[PDB]
Every structure is written in C-alpha cells, then in structure tokens.
Design an enzyme around this catalytic site. Structure first.
Site, mmCIF file in Angstrom:
data_model
loop_
_atom_site.group_PDB
_atom_site.id
_atom_site.type_symbol
_atom_site.label_atom_id
_atom_site.label_comp_id
_atom_site.label_asym_id
_atom_site.label_seq_id
_atom_site.Cartn_x
_atom_site.Cartn_y
_atom_site.Cartn_z
ATOM 1 N N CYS A 1 1.057 69.070 31.251
ATOM 2 C CA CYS A 1 0.690 67.820 31.928
ATOM 3 C C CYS A 1 1.636 67.425 33.063
ATOM 4 C CB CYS A 1 0.551 66.643 30.926
ATOM 5 S SG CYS A 1 0.076 65.130 31.781
ATOM 6 N N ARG B 1 3.078 63.251 33.488
ATOM 7 C CA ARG B 1 3.917 62.626 32.462
ATOM 8 C C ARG B 1 4.891 61.539 32.909
ATOM 9 N NH1 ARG B 1 6.266 67.582 29.347
ATOM 10 N NH2 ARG B 1 5.702 68.671 31.333
ATOM 11 N N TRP C 1 -6.210 59.285 34.827
ATOM 12 C CA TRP C 1 -6.972 59.334 36.079
ATOM 13 C C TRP C 1 -6.766 60.742 36.666
ATOM 14 C CZ3 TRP C 1 -3.014 55.551 35.505
ATOM 15 C CH2 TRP C 1 -1.754 55.862 36.112
ATOM 16 N N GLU D 1 -8.277 68.821 40.444
ATOM 17 C CA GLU D 1 -9.035 69.073 39.211
ATOM 18 C C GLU D 1 -10.534 69.075 39.529
ATOM 19 O OE1 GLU D 1 -7.527 67.092 35.413
ATOM 20 O OE2 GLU D 1 -6.576 65.807 36.938
#
Ligand code: HEM
Ligand code: HEM
Ligand SMILES: Cc1cc(N)nc(COC[C@@H](CN)OCc2cc(C)cc(N)n2)c1
Ligand SMILES: Cc1cc(N)nc(COC[C@@H](CN)OCc2cc(C)cc(N)n2)c1
Ligand SMILES: C[C@H](O)[C@H](O)[C@H]1CNc2nc(N)[nH]c(=O)c2N1
Ligand SMILES: C[C@H](O)[C@H](O)[C@H]1CNc2nc(N)[nH]c(=O)c2N1
Ligand SMILES: [Zn+2]
Lengths: 407, 411
Positions: free
Chosen positions: B108, B111, B280, B285
């Site tokens: 991730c 973070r 979000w 992506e």
C-alpha cells in the site's frame, strides 16, 4: 521444491526446476525479502571446476564419456600441481555465453547464444588491453549494425596481479563539479573523472566528453589511453515532430559496453571482461536523460512543449518523458544505429523465458530490473511472475579498484 | 541487528530494526527470491501467544505496558481463551488493530493516511440483510458526496470456520463482465466468473458495459444472498479529456470508491474474514490498469486511433502516448467533479516522506517495491530509486481463498 510461475495477463503457468541447481545466495531469507536492494584455494576450486565441466560435457552430449573423465582428471592434476587451471577455448566460449544466459537482470537474453567472444588471455600489458578494446569497439559497433561481444583478459591468480578496466563502461561521458555548484556533464561520473584528471588526463570540461580508458594489467598501476575518436559512434538527439528538440544539444553514444564486472567460469575469475550489446531506448531516454541525478532534462523539455508545470496532476513530467523517448528511438533509427524499444524487447524476453522453461526448465529473472522504467504495465513482463536465483557461470559485481589498489 | 536501505537518487540511507519483530514468512529463501510472485481453525495453544503479543503491542502504544490494566487484560484474555477457545477484542483494541493492519500493509502506497481510518464495528451483525445495511452505510459515509473518507467495516470473527462471514465480491463496487458466444467480452473481463455466479444466484443482468454488480453476502456460514446497492449511493465519474473533445464519446466512466472486500484481517490471532475497507484512488489504478491492461477494458488502440498516432510500429511509442492522455483524462475528470483522487507523483512523494518518518519513529516500514512503484512512468517517481525491505508484521490484511471454492452449500 518444484515452483510454478504464472502470467496474470495470459494465465500461462510454467514450472521451474532449474532453481534447484542454484549455488550462490540471494540476500533474502524466509523473514525478509531484499528483492529491491541494488547490491545485497585448491579445496574450493576443484568442485567448482567439476560442476562446470559436468555441465559443459552434458551440453555437448558427452556426459560420462572418456573425454569427459579425461578432462576432469586433467584439470584435477593441473589444480593439484599449479593451484589453478586453464580453460580450453571451447570451455571459455561456453562459459561466457552461459554467464549472459544466467544474467537475471538482463532483458536481452534471447540473444545469448549469438555472442562473439574475443580471447585476450594472452594480453600482458595495458597497451595490449587498449588494442584489444579498440578492436572490440570497432567489431561491436560495425558502423551502426551492432554485434554483441565480450573480450576476456587473463584470469585472477593470487589477486595481486588483477586485470581491471577502471571505467564502468568502455564509453561514458565525463562529469565535473563546477564552482557554480552545479554539475557539468554526467553527474554519475564525477569521481571517476577526478581519478582520470588526477592521473594526468587533460579534461576538455564540456558536457559530453568521452572518458579515456584507465587500464590495469597484471596488477600494475593503471594507465590512460584515449579511444580513437573515430571509433566512438555517437547519435545527435532530435525529434520527428519537434524541430526545437535538436537545440537542446543532446547526444548519446551508440555502444553500451559494461566494463566493471567479474566473469566467473568454473571457479576461475575474469576480473576484466568488457561486454557489449545494443541499447533498449529507455536506458537512454528514461534513465540517462531524465533521472534527477543524471542529465535531468525533464523541465527544459516540458517548457519547450509549453506544458502546465504548476501541478503534478497535469502529468507534464509523463508527457515530456514519452517525447524524450520518442526522440531517442527516432535518432538512433534515422542514423541506422541498432536500438530496441521496450515493447519489442520485453515481448522478446517473454518468448525467451518460454524457450528456457521448455528447454532448460527455467530462467532466473529479477522482475525489479526486467520491467522497463516507464510504462511498466503496458509491457508483458509486468504481468509475468519471475523467480530470481543465481546460477554459475555468472557476471558479478566487484569492488571499484581505486578502493582496492595499492599504488 | 540493523539493515540499511539506500535511496539511489538522494544517497539518503535508512536503518531498519523493525524487521526483528517480523513473524510470518515471506516465501523467499537464501537460494530463491519470490518477490514478484502475486500469492506466495486455530488451536487454543497457538492463540494465547498471538493474543499476548498483540496486547503487549497495544499496551506499549498507549504507554501502559506492564500496568495493572495491561496485566488484568492478559489474565482476562487467558481465562476467556481457556474457557471459550477464543476471545473478544475491546473496541479500542479493534480500532488500533485495524489501523495497524493498514500501517503494516507493505503493498500500500497510501499509508501516510493510516492513522485516519473510520472503523465501523459490525460484530453484532447476524444476517446477510444486516451485512447489506452495514455496507450501504459504509459506502455512503466513505463517499461523502465526493470528499472521500477512509473506512473499514468489521464483521464477526471466525469461530469454527464453518460459520464465516464473507463478502463474495472482490470489491464493494465493480462492473459486471459477460463473455459472449463469439468469445468477446462486454464490460470488465476481470469480473466474468463472479458475474456468472451472480446470474446463477438470480441477478437480472442489464448486460451493458458498466453495470454495477450486486453484493453477494454470506453471514454466519449460510448460503450467500444478493442485494443491489442503491444506485444513488454509487458515485461515478464520466471520463473526459481537457483538450480532446472526442474522449467523452468513448463512453467511459468509473466509480469513485475503491473498496477491497475479499481480504482477511488478522488481529491478535483472531480472523475477520469479512472486513471491507475503502480509501480513494490513485489515478493510475484506473487509467493504467483498469483502462489499459489487455485483460481489462483494453482501450489503448481506440484512444491511439482517435489521436492519429503512428500505429505501424511499437517504436513510435503510440501506446505510451495514449497511456499518458488517458491518465490525464482520469485525473481531470475526478478533479472536475470534486471526487477525491491522487496522482502517482503526489502519492509516491507522500509515501517516501511517510516511509522516512516510519523509519525514524518506528524503526522501519515494510514495503513491497514491485507493488509500490506505479505501473507507468516508474523511474520518474521517487519510489523507483528507493530500496525497500519487505517483511510481514501483524496485525495484517491477508489473502484468502475465494468463497465459491470453499463454501459448503446448504441448498
Ligand atoms: C544485445 C542486446 C542487449 C540488450 C537489449 C540488453 C538489455 C539489458 C538492459 C536494459 C539491462 C538493464 C540495464 C540497466 O538498467 O542498467 C541489462 C542488464 C544486464 N545485461 Fe544485458 N542486454 C544486451 C546484451 C547483453 C550482453 C551481450 C551481455 C553479456 C555478454 C549482457 C549482460 C547483462 C548484465 C550482466 C546485466 C546486469 C548489469 C548490472 O547489474 O549492472 N547483456 N541488459
Ligand atoms: C486513502 C487512500 C489510499 C490510497 C491512495 C491507496 C493506494 C493503494 C494502491 C495504488 C494500492 C495497489 C492497488 C492495486 O494495484 O491493486 C493499494 C493496495 C493496498 N492497500 Fe491501499 N490505498 C489507500 C487506502 C487504503 C486503506 C484505507 C486500506 C485499509 C485500511 C488500504 C490497504 C491496502 C491493502 C491491504 C493493499 C494490498 C491489496 C492487495 O494485495 O490486493 N489502503 N493501496
Ligand atoms: C551489455 C549491455 C547492453 C545494454 N543494452 N545495456 C547495458 C547496461 O548498461 C550499463 C549499465 C550497467 N548497470 O550502466 C548504467 C548505469 C549507470 C549508473 C549510474 C548506475 C547503474 N547501476 N547503471 C549493458
Ligand atoms: C483501499 C484501497 C484504496 C485504493 N486506492 N486502491 C485499492 C486497491 O484496489 C483494489 C484492487 C486490490 N488489489 O483490486 C484490483 C485487482 C483486480 C484483479 C482482477 C486482480 C487483483 N489482484 N487486483 C484499495
Ligand atoms: C532501488 C532499486 O532497486 C533501483 O532503483 C533499481 C530499480 N530497477 C532498476 N532496473 C533497471 N533495469 N536498472 C536499474 O538501475 C534499476 N534500479
Ligand atoms: C507478476 C507481478 O507480481 C504482478 O503483475 C504485479 C506487479 N506489480 C503490481 N503492482 C500493483 N500495485 N498492483 C498489481 O496488481 C501488481 N501486479
Ligand atoms: Zn526476496
């Protein structure tokens, strides 16, 4: 023990068994992955020789043969007698090709069996090294029709008589710290340039000065030689649509030639073994041109394109990056200097991985290095699981010699 | 022991000690690195050490380590485990646990935000209808009319593994995909198998290109049940381009709320098999993966055509050109509609600052380079040049088998 790799785009699954041969260590453990880290006697020598000769005799379908056993004994006697041994020409050539084949960080290995090997084991002086290297340069360059080559200088003996090319590549550009505080030329090459100047090189103090060679024979102090200018093929960088691009005054050299690595074959160590292929365009256009600590040209290009640079989300860096990479490929193709784009190169590597799995039971690959530094997921290697492991013969990193050399 | 990581652009070296707290295994060995592999019922005896280590970490974090409250809580958990085979987390521990699983998620890039997470405690849920209601509330809260807020909803933990809560959807909001008889796909080709399950279960498929899938929900190990998310709760952004007026006529849109629903949250040895979480999007992506993967909406050609790029040879970099334009379009559209989104430059820059802070205050930041580096323009982001160490800390988010592979059907 038998491991599967999956391609997530195509669903094709391959089984790796070749990893069970791996000898050297990875830097990872079961507790910690170090996948992204850039740099993680007579007794020892004979098993290393045997392991190699076994693989060699296997490759020519003569495993367990008279000639196989006879060579193993011959090498054993030679090591017992002289503490080292000499590779036959056939062995040296096989070893060199397999070190490339085994290079987990190289996307270009579909080419591995087409390597011209120049045996420079008879070289004794730095002037001899210079002559061999000019010949390599001219052979590999081939007026723009590039040919893969390696030149192999004498193996390590007691380690006090090493052959080394002090340069990191045969052809690179100088870098100079300016009183200004900025850096002129290639910022990556500042320390090595200082060593050259310090050893006597008359530096032009320009942006694109080709470095002299600093050559070390037989562990003697290294010497300076300038590659004949007319053997160094360079390409001025221009853009097919942007007439202003040429006014940035950019050029790159045609021959990528790594000269700082150690070739290990059958336990023998070849500390000077410059090798060359041809460029993938991103190596120049993404890395050399656009790295913050390299030529760092993104801002200047973006400005000439009149992009909105007030906010990252306009993707002005990304737009400029693509254009710089377009110009690199166009300039090399227009001057007929061999180059491969990252789409074509990664497609070839996928076909090569499939061959290697089919024919050898695997292919060690370092995904972090194989995936191109731009447009990663639009290339097929992004979606390909890879296993990274170390096979010998191999190319290894080794300490920079100025840290190691006693004058 | 100390491990060092170097940034090759800045020469900044960081020192990791947090890796000493790692328990779970990576998949790698001293002979093989599996760093690019995507995917590399608990006894009483194993549970109390896991509880204890978690409670030790919680109590340390509140500077109450070794206190009477800490000791009493260890004893209370020990007695609960020996008497009931399991235990219940306090609300405070659950919140801490969920935040830390995010903090620990090495894949991730987002973070920096880990401490700002709204935790919805759904452990009193008993039925799929109850799950549906919890999830609608999560979606509406998280969406916040475009001003997105990170959130997680946590359903009851695993007991015997025969009574699991699961969300069968891989994300709360996704588009259907339909394989046609001629082998083409309408909609999102990644969601074909799941769409077929939904239809088998009775969903009446509109059969368009962007049909929001129904939720398929399993409570207490029972057969899963279908629910439609109220369309008015599903925020979507039509995708258009700032300069290319033909871009809108490609008919693309995407949903604003990325909400992973198929992972398992492990806290103190307890297993929350249904724990949908949301933040979000980072623009790539959608613009790189969802739009341009060959196995997804695959729009590169049509975009490149409309731009009149030279498509006769890959070396014109037409794919790269069209890729940038699509991603500009995604960011422009979200921004224009006031739907939270972050670009890959901003996100990665923030991650590096987050990572340096973690090294200094926590002793490390496990990170998976293969996942952290964005899928376009890699080396012009600061993460590309950053060495990272990947290891597993608990609490954690883990993969789990898809429930259609494991579910015992009641009928
Ligand atoms: C013929 C065309 C070739 C292509 C297109 C190619 C491609 C590449 C690329 C893109 C890299 C990454 C470079 C970087 O990011 O710094 C690389 C690395 C490497 N290649 Fe190749 N290669 C070629 C030929 C060769 C040859 C002829 C050899 C040896 C005989 C070789 C051995 C290596 C090694 C050892 C590395 C890792 C270098 C390092 O760790 O710094 N390659 N290759
Ligand atoms: C707040 C904004 C956030 C942003 C911009 C963000 C960014 C991302 C991105 C780009 C990925 C990789 C996604 C992919 O390629 O499939 C990811 C993965 C992940 N994130 Fe985040 N993230 C955010 C919030 C969260 C939250 C709230 C959680 C949980 C509390 C979380 C936990 C995870 C996990 C577990 C993964 C790995 C998922 C997997 O392996 O499939 N993230 N993040
Ligand atoms: C043989 C060959 C062919 C080909 N296309 N490319 C290469 C690689 O080029 C040389 C590479 C070796 N890492 O050097 C570039 C470089 C520069 C700097 C500053 C650091 C670094 N790791 N690498 C080698
Ligand atoms: C919470 C969150 C925020 C944010 N910005 N992004 C995410 C991740 O998005 C969902 C991802 C989970 N990896 O799902 C995409 C996906 C699709 C498919 C078909 C496979 C796969 N591994 N992953 C999650
Ligand atoms: C930290 C990281 O390993 C480093 O920046 C790497 C990433 N991938 C790379 N990939 C290639 N081909 N060449 C490189 O120099 C690097 N550098
Ligand atoms: C095989 C490889 O690990 C796979 O394609 C990965 C690479 N990196 C990724 N990175 C992110 N953020 N998301 C992904 O799905 C992937 N996929
Ligand atoms: Zn590893």
């Amino acid at each position: 023990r038998f491991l599967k790799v999956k391609n997530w785009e195509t669903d094709v699954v391959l089984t790796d068994t070749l990893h069970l041969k791996s000898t050297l260590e990875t830097g990872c453990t079961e507790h910690i992955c170090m996948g992204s880290i850039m740099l993680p006697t007579k007794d020892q020598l004979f098993p290393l020789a045997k392991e190699f000769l076994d693989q060699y005799y296997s490759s020519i379908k003569r495993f367990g043969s008279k000639a196989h056993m006879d060579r193993l004994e011959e090498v054993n006697k030679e090591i017992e007698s002289t503490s080292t041994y000499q590779l036959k020409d056939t062995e040296l050539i096989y070893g060199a090709k397999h070190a490339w084949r085994n290079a987990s960080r190289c996307v270009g290995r579909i080419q591995w069996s087409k390597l011209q090997v120049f045996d420079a084991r008879d070289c004794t002086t730095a002037h001899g090294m210079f002559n061999y290297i000019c010949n390599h340069v001219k052979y590999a360059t081939n007026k723009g029709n590039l040919r893969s080559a390696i030149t192999i200088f004498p193996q390590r003996t007691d380690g006090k008589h090493d052959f080394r090319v002090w340069n990191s590549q045969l052809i690179r550009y100088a870098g100079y710290k300016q009183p200004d505080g900025s850096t002129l030329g290639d910022p990556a090459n500042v320390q090595f340039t200082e060593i050259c100047i310090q050893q006597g090189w008359k530096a032009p103090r320009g942006r694109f000065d080709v470095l002299p060679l600093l050559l070390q024979a037989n562990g003697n102090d290294p010497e300076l030689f300038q590659i004949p200018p007319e053997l160094v093929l360079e390409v001025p960088i221009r853009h097919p649509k942007f007439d202003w691009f040429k006014d940035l005054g950019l050029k790159w050299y045609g021959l990528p030639a790594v000269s700082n690595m150690l070739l290990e074959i059958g336990g023998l160590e070849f500390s000077a073994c410059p090798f060359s292929g041809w460029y993938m365009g991103t190596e120049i256009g993404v890395r050399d041109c656009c790295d913050n600590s390299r030529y760092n040209i993104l801002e200047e290009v973006a400005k000439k394109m009149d992009l909105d640079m007030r906010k990252t989300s306009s993707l002005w860096k990304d737009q400029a990056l693509v254009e710089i990479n377009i110009a690199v490929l166009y300039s090399f193709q227009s001057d007929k200097v061999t180059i491969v784009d990252h789409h074509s190169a990664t497609e070839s590597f996928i076909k090569h991985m499939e061959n290697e799995y089919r024919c050898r039971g695997g292919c060690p690959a370092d995904w972090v290095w194989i995936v191109p530094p731009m447009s990663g997921s639009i290339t097929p290697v992004f979606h390909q699981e890879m296993l990274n492991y170390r096979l010998t013969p191999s190319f290894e990193y080794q300490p920079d010699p100025w840290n190691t050399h006693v004058w």
